[PDB]
Write a protein that binds this DNA or RNA. Structure first.
Ligand SMILES: [Mg+2]
Ligand SMILES: [Mg+2]
Ligand SMILES: [Mg+2]
Ligand SMILES: [Mg+2]
Ligand SMILES: [Mg+2]
Ligand SMILES: [Mg+2]
Ligand SMILES: [Mg+2]
Ligand SMILES: [Mg+2]
Ligand SMILES: [Mg+2]
Ligand SMILES: [Mg+2]
Ligand SMILES: [Mg+2]
Ligand SMILES: [Mg+2]
Ligand SMILES: [Mg+2]
Ligand SMILES: [Mg+2]
Ligand SMILES: [Mg+2]
Ligand SMILES: [Mg+2]
Ligand SMILES: [Mg+2]
Ligand SMILES: [Mg+2]
Ligand SMILES: [Mg+2]
Ligand SMILES: [Mg+2]
Ligand SMILES: [Mg+2]
Ligand SMILES: [Mg+2]
Ligand SMILES: [Mg+2]
Ligand SMILES: [Mg+2]
Ligand SMILES: [Mg+2]
Ligand SMILES: [Mg+2]
Ligand SMILES: [Mg+2]
Ligand SMILES: [Mg+2]
Ligand SMILES: [Mg+2]
Ligand SMILES: [Mg+2]
Ligand SMILES: [Mg+2]
Ligand SMILES: [Mg+2]
Ligand SMILES: [Mg+2]
Ligand SMILES: [Mg+2]
Ligand SMILES: [Mg+2]
Ligand SMILES: [Mg+2]
Ligand SMILES: [Mg+2]
Ligand SMILES: [Mg+2]
Ligand SMILES: [Mg+2]
Ligand SMILES: [Mg+2]
Ligand SMILES: [Mg+2]
Ligand SMILES: [Mg+2]
Ligand SMILES: [Mg+2]
Ligand SMILES: [Mg+2]
Ligand SMILES: [Mg+2]
Ligand SMILES: [Mg+2]
Ligand SMILES: [Mg+2]
Ligand SMILES: [Mg+2]
Ligand SMILES: [Mg+2]
Ligand SMILES: [Mg+2]
Ligand SMILES: [Mg+2]
Ligand SMILES: [Mg+2]
Ligand SMILES: [Mg+2]
Ligand SMILES: [Mg+2]
Ligand SMILES: [Mg+2]
Ligand SMILES: [Mg+2]
Ligand SMILES: [Mg+2]
Ligand SMILES: [Mg+2]
Ligand SMILES: [Mg+2]
Ligand SMILES: [Mg+2]
Ligand SMILES: [Mg+2]
Ligand SMILES: [Mg+2]
Ligand SMILES: [Mg+2]
Ligand SMILES: [Mg+2]
Ligand SMILES: [Mg+2]
Ligand SMILES: [Mg+2]
Ligand SMILES: [Mg+2]
Ligand SMILES: [Mg+2]
Ligand SMILES: [Mg+2]
Ligand SMILES: [Mg+2]
Ligand SMILES: [Mg+2]
Ligand SMILES: [Mg+2]
Ligand SMILES: [Mg+2]
Ligand SMILES: [Mg+2]
Ligand SMILES: [Mg+2]
Ligand SMILES: [Mg+2]
Ligand SMILES: [Mg+2]
Ligand SMILES: [Mg+2]
Ligand SMILES: [Mg+2]
Ligand SMILES: [Mg+2]
Ligand SMILES: [Mg+2]
Ligand SMILES: [Mg+2]
Ligand SMILES: [Mg+2]
Ligand SMILES: [Mg+2]
Ligand SMILES: [Mg+2]
Ligand SMILES: [Mg+2]
Ligand SMILES: [Mg+2]
Ligand SMILES: [Mg+2]
Ligand SMILES: [Mg+2]
Ligand SMILES: [Mg+2]
Ligand SMILES: [Mg+2]
Ligand SMILES: [Mg+2]
Ligand SMILES: [Mg+2]
Ligand SMILES: [Mg+2]
Ligand SMILES: [Mg+2]
Ligand SMILES: [Mg+2]
Ligand SMILES: [Mg+2]
Ligand SMILES: [Mg+2]
Ligand SMILES: [Mg+2]
Ligand SMILES: [Mg+2]
Ligand SMILES: [Mg+2]
Ligand SMILES: [Mg+2]
Ligand SMILES: [Mg+2]
Ligand SMILES: [Mg+2]
Ligand SMILES: [Mg+2]
Ligand SMILES: [Mg+2]
Ligand SMILES: [Mg+2]
Ligand SMILES: [Mg+2]
Ligand SMILES: [Mg+2]
Ligand SMILES: [Mg+2]
Ligand SMILES: [Mg+2]
Ligand SMILES: [Mg+2]
Ligand SMILES: [Mg+2]
Ligand SMILES: [Mg+2]
Ligand SMILES: [Mg+2]
Ligand SMILES: [Mg+2]
Ligand SMILES: [Mg+2]
Ligand SMILES: [Mg+2]
Ligand SMILES: [Mg+2]
Ligand SMILES: [Mg+2]
Ligand SMILES: [Mg+2]
Length: 114
RNA sequence: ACCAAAGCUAGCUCAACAACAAAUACAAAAAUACACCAAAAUAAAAUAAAACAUUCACCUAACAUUAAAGUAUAGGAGAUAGAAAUUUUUAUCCUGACGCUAUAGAGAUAGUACCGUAAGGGAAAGAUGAAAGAAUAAAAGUAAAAAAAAGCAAAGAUUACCCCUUCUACCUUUUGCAUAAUGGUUUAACCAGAAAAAAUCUAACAAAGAGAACUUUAGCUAGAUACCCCGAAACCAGACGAGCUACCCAUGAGCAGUUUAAAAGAACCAACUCAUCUAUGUGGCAAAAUAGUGAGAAGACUUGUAGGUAGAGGUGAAAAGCCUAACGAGCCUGGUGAUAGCUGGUUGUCCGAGAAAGAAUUUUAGUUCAACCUUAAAAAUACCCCAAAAACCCUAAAUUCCAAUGUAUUUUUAAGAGAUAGUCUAAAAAGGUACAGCUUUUUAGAAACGGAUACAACCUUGACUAGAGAGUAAAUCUUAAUACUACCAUAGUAGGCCUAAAAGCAGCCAUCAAUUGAGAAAGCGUUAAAGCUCAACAAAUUCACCAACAUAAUCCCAAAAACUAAUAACAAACUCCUAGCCCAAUACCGGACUAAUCUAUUGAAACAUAGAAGCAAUAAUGUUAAUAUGAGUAACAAGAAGCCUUUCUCCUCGCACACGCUUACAUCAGUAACUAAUAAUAUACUGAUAAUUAACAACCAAUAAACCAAAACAACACUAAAACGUUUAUUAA
RNA sequence: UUUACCAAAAACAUCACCUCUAGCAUUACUAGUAUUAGAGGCAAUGCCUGCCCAGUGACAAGUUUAACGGCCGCGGUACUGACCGUGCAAAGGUAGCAUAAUCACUUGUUCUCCAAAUAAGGACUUGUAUGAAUGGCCACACGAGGGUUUUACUGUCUCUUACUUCCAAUCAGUGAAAUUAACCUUCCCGUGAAGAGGCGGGAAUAAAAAAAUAAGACGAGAAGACCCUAUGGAGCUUUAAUUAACUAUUCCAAAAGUUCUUAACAUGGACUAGCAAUUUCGGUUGGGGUGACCUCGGAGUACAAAAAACCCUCCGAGUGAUUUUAAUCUAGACAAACCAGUCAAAAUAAUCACUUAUUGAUCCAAAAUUUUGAUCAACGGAACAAGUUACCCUAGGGAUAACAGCGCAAUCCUGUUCUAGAGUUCCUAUCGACAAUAGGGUUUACGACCUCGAUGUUGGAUCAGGACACCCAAAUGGUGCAGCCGCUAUUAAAGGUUCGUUUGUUCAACGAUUAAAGUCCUACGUGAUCUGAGUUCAGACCGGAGCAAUCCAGGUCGGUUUCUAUCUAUUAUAAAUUUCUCCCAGUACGAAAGGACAAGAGAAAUGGGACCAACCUCACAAACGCGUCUCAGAGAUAAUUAAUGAUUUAAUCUUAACCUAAUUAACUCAUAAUAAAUCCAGCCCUAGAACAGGGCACA
């Protein structure tokens, strides 16, 4: 009996998208925080956005997650319109990641007393 | 008590040093007549490359030894292969043995018996003593000594052998084996893990270490720790084979009768040749037969002796036939311990810890990485883990991540393997038939010697060794199902409407109104009527209603049971108790001891410290020897009587030669045991002695020349055109 | 003439007929010379041999089929199509013959042949897959070829029998073989790696010999010839991929001479062929083949961190479109077996197309100053290799098929529950759509769980064990049952359940009968009892498919069936069944036409048990059938009919009493067999394999 199943190429590995660090994790500058294919979490304070929508930590610190108000860039039109048609009482919210800096910025050392 | 058992020698390993005489290549072993001689062309493949085409060390040569160096180079630049320049080396003498004892060591008492036509293969065995010029009772198997209901053959035990009670042979192989999967009759003797790069361990000397060349940021140098056995079909080179069979070339030989003018690939039918059909036979009488029955039988006929063609070939009236009792390609010896991701085997004891499949792959019967894990080391946190936190429409069980806290685990570093062919149970889903002892993933569990009788996965429990102590755990199998009863029945009016009729009761409309009470009717009934009951009083009594489901093939499947009181009792490897040497296991990996040899010193009767190894067989359809079982079974043979070679009774491959065998033949003697498949006695066993006598048969000249004229009862012919010598001359001991 | 040893044939050869290739001398052919000699085809004779040079050949562009090989559509029209249109071809299958030793349908149609024929012969005949030297068609004569009829003959058979001889069993000699874990070696039903002498629950059971029979020990023999798998082999064939030697060819050099030639040898490099070499023939797969797929990404499966399978369900990619040319160097990271993949601060000075996928490692090649090279798509990639094997071989596997078992029950098979409907009226006498719920385990499948160091597989023969979902016989309910037949339903397994023609056949048709000529299971019972016609190896044709080798669950002809029994098992008690007659009574029953049971007498037949006076077989005094004899009481109940009679004062056979009654098969048992303990040497026997048993006083 002809057993042809017409479907092809279901097979891909998973991309291991997801959250790499968790709230209250210590982080060094450069660590990737989470990696996603669509924006699930947006970059907050001290979190840089990679061209593939990676989130990495800019400072040395503690990673925090947050629900905050979303005010799209006036250059990006779709989001501008989505913001436009809302009923007059409602604001948009999203989830952000943050780094909270640990090390102080610097120190004043006494080099020489002349 | 038989059968058996034991010796220590014959000789071997490895290494230093350095009886002529005759006869013979005629068909070897034969004194002697005319010739010829003599010759040479790369090694290939098996195998590595996980296939296979280029390529694959060693295999011929010498060159040795310490180095340069596994370096320069050469390679489907893969596998692997691999120099030189230049360097080093003191003499002989000084022989032996941590080499084997008769399944070893030579194959050897022998290249012999024997097996092959031939090249070639190739065994087995000996044991007393000074003297034979003296005559231990320990393997299996059996005997002494048949066997008495029952059941992996034992164990717990008992006064007692049984009788009771408790237990699925062992290996290998698998997901899982009592399996009705493989292996083995039993005994003995043989019969299977080898390497030192990196590492660890123990020592030397140390900024150096090594008895030369090298390596060095604690290193070097030395020791010690390591990696099997048996199997193809094949492929390549060189020999040997045509005494079988295939086909040829020589030289011979058969074919009677009967029929026909006939030797005409004609008839009939013997000898002779084939092999049709059936039955016997099947470890046979026979590695292809016998009995009957059949085909051909002067021809493409059968058959004897002697040549020839040889495997990359020959031969073939093609059957891929035949070429020496296996031919899709002979046999033998080499290559050759060919190569097997594939079976099958792999030998002492006792302890520690212990594994289930993520990737790639001519890969899915295999490897190599990760993860888990084992053995050492260094460290610091590891599991558990409350808020807090992880997405956008709907979205359960739950994950991820972390302090406290309960515990001791986890990570790194250095070495290593196996494993990577899983099963079921619960849960979430797919596919299929909302089927599988079905298949495919994800999360858990399990693989008791206790329960579910029996039992791999379910349930109770985790583990040692003794006790003729205790407490408990899971669990023994129960549960049910019934009835319907009075008495009575007139009215408009067969209401309209339809319709053959239509009268409650074919369908539409209406649902009215007498009686105290009876529907313009819920059933059947009739063509329509007619007729039966239900609803309505009257008389009474009232208690219910939610009903159930045939069978399989050897022979039903503990026996039984309503009851003396139960939060019983009885029940494990669990847990107490009394003592300890103090807690399971396949692959793989760590440790501690020791059996038997030999060598160093001890030891003296069995030895104890070391060093060494041919270092330990219950399993390979293992090898050899010997024993059983089947089994005293299958099967084998001699015509009668006498006075002992004389008569009888029956059936018919007989005497010579050729080839081939070699004393098997003849006489006398002996036969306990060897040969005869048994006896008697002897042509076939043993000893001694003899024997076949040449006129038959073998051996036995050349060169010239004449000669066209078949055998066939041979007159003469036929087509297919036929084997064979006389005579003359020249010389011939 | 052939497969010495499974096939003597239709296979091969062969007279004859045709194609090719050759013009010549010392070893073949050949001491030959084209009427000859070599390669072949096809098979006498007779009548024939159609059309086709486009492919591949082969020859010396052209030529060739008695070379390899081919020889059609589509529709329109007088049920058909002589005609018609248009298309493609190198030509369009003709003369014959025909259901065939010719794919299937298919047991074609019909006649003859028989009581009956899937056989045989004759016809028709599109054979859509005949067909003319890979020969087509008739015909003598011949086949140990295949098929069919008749005569005749008979032990083939109805349906067996007697007697001899070899074996045979007892005595005496001699004395093997495969095989064997150990066995102190039962039966049943369960269980279990799915078929138990060993497990569980029950049964049964002094001990050993000899003789028999073959159900079991997945019996004994051969490390399965089937199947699949090894990066195992080999033989065969070509368009597989790489290509020598050789034999021939053609050419250029060389060599000799000429001013362009080659006599025979003969070397270097080519070419073109023949013969010929070396090596392979990927993988997944609910066995393999055929089919399909092999890398890369989005969804689902996989619901909320990651991961996550299938020959799972669905969509995509092997690049475009631009402009703005999207740079160096280095912290920290994700991911990850490895290889590859990803983000990215500081320091110096690409976008849109769901956007995610648009891609290939080393080595080796070309390039310039630096870099580009693949349906390597089997996508972690061998620098370059296909077909076959039924002539096959080895290593393995029950890791995986075919047989059988087991699981499951889609399909199949028996019931019930529900009434629409049929049945004129009437659901359920006889049935019954759409549907519900239980069962059975034989079918075709599906799984791959035991077996590949063998569990030998279809149909018969013989002998049967069992189920009951009764085909007969036996009791009964209902009827759209007057009676006779019937049609349905309930209870009953002791006994039965035929002989033929055609097929290998179970099935099926058909002839003739029977009381009936059941449906099943038992390894589709039964091959250490038998038979192999069939499937299923080697030979061979004929369609077809391939260029071939070979091949098609397509036909046809032919073709080895081995075991001496160790163990378990087993090796004779009886106590009938069925017809058909004759009667009754031509009566009961119906308007008549047709027409019964029950009771009672007879005959047979079959099955048990025996026996020879006759007959028949008989050369023994016996054995034997074709001949003769003899065959049973009582008790029980199943389904169903009735009486008294309560719960419930009527009723009511009652899963209420008490007695009851009527009625099958089994199954019991009356009755029958056997049944005196020990002398046994001999010798007789109607008794016997041995041992046992009966006789041996007359007479
Ligand atoms: Mg996906
Ligand atoms: Mg995946
Ligand atoms: Mg190789
Ligand atoms: Mg190998
Ligand atoms: Mg190979
Ligand atoms: Mg070599
Ligand atoms: Mg020796
Ligand atoms: Mg000899
Ligand atoms: Mg003994
Ligand atoms: Mg016992
Ligand atoms: Mg078991
Ligand atoms: Mg074994
Ligand atoms: Mg298995
Ligand atoms: Mg079994
Ligand atoms: Mg077996
Ligand atoms: Mg096996
Ligand atoms: Mg055996
Ligand atoms: Mg070392
Ligand atoms: Mg050190
Ligand atoms: Mg080779
Ligand atoms: Mg090879
Ligand atoms: Mg010869
Ligand atoms: Mg000869
Ligand atoms: Mg004659
Ligand atoms: Mg003749
Ligand atoms: Mg005869
Ligand atoms: Mg004859
Ligand atoms: Mg004849
Ligand atoms: Mg011949
Ligand atoms: Mg042939
Ligand atoms: Mg053949
Ligand atoms: Mg031979
Ligand atoms: Mg080997
Ligand atoms: Mg590959
Ligand atoms: Mg493999
Ligand atoms: Mg923590
Ligand atoms: Mg498997
Ligand atoms: Mg594997
Ligand atoms: Mg079950
Ligand atoms: Mg698990
Ligand atoms: Mg138990
Ligand atoms: Mg304990
Ligand atoms: Mg009225
Ligand atoms: Mg009223
Ligand atoms: Mg206890
Ligand atoms: Mg342990
Ligand atoms: Mg040893
Ligand atoms: Mg031993
Ligand atoms: Mg054997
Ligand atoms: Mg052994
Ligand atoms: Mg014996
Ligand atoms: Mg016997
Ligand atoms: Mg005998
Ligand atoms: Mg005799
Ligand atoms: Mg002689
Ligand atoms: Mg003798
Ligand atoms: Mg012959
Ligand atoms: Mg033969
Ligand atoms: Mg024959
Ligand atoms: Mg012929
Ligand atoms: Mg000619
Ligand atoms: Mg002809
Ligand atoms: Mg023609
Ligand atoms: Mg025609
Ligand atoms: Mg046909
Ligand atoms: Mg044709
Ligand atoms: Mg032709
Ligand atoms: Mg033809
Ligand atoms: Mg003739
Ligand atoms: Mg003939
Ligand atoms: Mg004939
Ligand atoms: Mg005897
Ligand atoms: Mg017994
Ligand atoms: Mg079972
Ligand atoms: Mg059983
Ligand atoms: Mg006997
Ligand atoms: Mg038997
Ligand atoms: Mg057994
Ligand atoms: Mg059997
Ligand atoms: Mg095998
Ligand atoms: Mg193969
Ligand atoms: Mg191969
Ligand atoms: Mg080669
Ligand atoms: Mg393939
Ligand atoms: Mg495959
Ligand atoms: Mg398949
Ligand atoms: Mg399957
Ligand atoms: Mg395919
Ligand atoms: Mg920057
Ligand atoms: Mg390239
Ligand atoms: Mg591949
Ligand atoms: Mg791949
Ligand atoms: Mg990949
Ligand atoms: Mg054939
Ligand atoms: Mg084999
Ligand atoms: Mg299996
Ligand atoms: Mg079977
Ligand atoms: Mg099956
Ligand atoms: Mg079975
Ligand atoms: Mg069922
Ligand atoms: Mg099924
Ligand atoms: Mg499976
Ligand atoms: Mg098998
Ligand atoms: Mg066996
Ligand atoms: Mg029967
Ligand atoms: Mg019944
Ligand atoms: Mg019966
Ligand atoms: Mg059968
Ligand atoms: Mg059979
Ligand atoms: Mg049998
Ligand atoms: Mg053909
Ligand atoms: Mg025949
Ligand atoms: Mg046949
Ligand atoms: Mg037989
Ligand atoms: Mg016996
Ligand atoms: Mg027998
Ligand atoms: Mg009788
Ligand atoms: Mg009453
Ligand atoms: Mg009454
Ligand atoms: Mg009795
Ligand atoms: Mg007596």
């Amino acid at each position: 009996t002809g057993g042809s199943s017409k479907n092809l190429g279901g097979k891909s590995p998973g991309k291991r998208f997801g959250i790499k660090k968790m709230e209250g994790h210590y982080v060094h500058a450069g660590n990737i925080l989470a990696t996603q294919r669509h924006f699930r979490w947006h970059p907050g304070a001290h979190v840089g956005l990679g061209k593939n929508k990676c989130l990495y930590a800019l400072e040395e610190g503690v990673v925090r997650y947050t629900k905050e108000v979303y005010v799209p860039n006036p250059s990006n039109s779709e989001a501008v319109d989505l913001v436009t048609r809302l009923p007059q009482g409602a604001v948009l919210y999203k989830t952000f990641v943050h780094v909270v800096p640990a090390k102080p910025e610097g120190t004043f050392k006494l080099v020489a007393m002349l």
